[PDB]
């Protein structure tokens, strides 16, 4: 019944230009995220808003949809639709700001749901350590 949420940032080598183009990329997830198999849309719309992608991973699958999209503001708000995980009300969120030195990317990814599993502070470290972390260390070595 409680609303977790998590929030990870981090400083990727990369311009914010080339992390926006592979993120906003919404179907590319499995090309840079190890525990992602494949990743393609279900249905994909010209202006971005309202595409649906599925992700299939190692332990079961999701499928998202792409609820909000500003490249001004390097902003992105997803949502689950549909996952074989104990998942309720999933919402994820990227917030890119450019850094000038060395022309890096400050990434910041916070998710928010509910669940029924019975140990939720594993869940949430499951996916703090194995989902989002490991999905910003990905982005930075897909750029190596
Ligand atoms: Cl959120
Ligand atoms: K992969």
Same mark, same amino acid.
């Given at each position: 019944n409680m609303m977790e949420c998590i929030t990870?940032?981090?400083?990727?080598?990369?311009?914010?230009?080339?992390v926006w183009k592979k993120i906003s990329a919404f179907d590319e997830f499995s090309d840079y995220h190890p525990g992602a198999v494949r990743? !393609?849309?279900?249905?994909?719309?010209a202006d971005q808003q309202g595409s649906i992608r599925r992700v299939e991973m190692?332990?079961?699958?999701?499928?998202?949809?792409?609820?909000?999209?500003?490249?001004?503001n390097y902003h992105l708000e997803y949502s689950i639709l549909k996952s074989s995980f104990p998942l309720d009300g999933y919402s994820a969120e990227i917030k890119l700001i450019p850094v000038t030195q060395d022309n890096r990317t400050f990434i910041?990814?916070?998710?928010? !749901?509910?669940?029924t599993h019975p140990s939720p502070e594993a869940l949430?470290?499951?996916?703090?350590?194995n989902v989002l972390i490991?999905?910003?260390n990905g982005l930075n070595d897909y750029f190596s």
């Open positions: 990870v940032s981090d400083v990727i080598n990369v311009s914010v230009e080339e990743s !393609f849309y279900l249905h994909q719309a190692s332990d079961g699958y999701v499928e998202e949809l792409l609820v909000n999209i500003d490249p001004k910041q990814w916070n998710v928010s !749901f509910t669940t949430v470290a499951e996916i703090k350590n490991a999905g910003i």
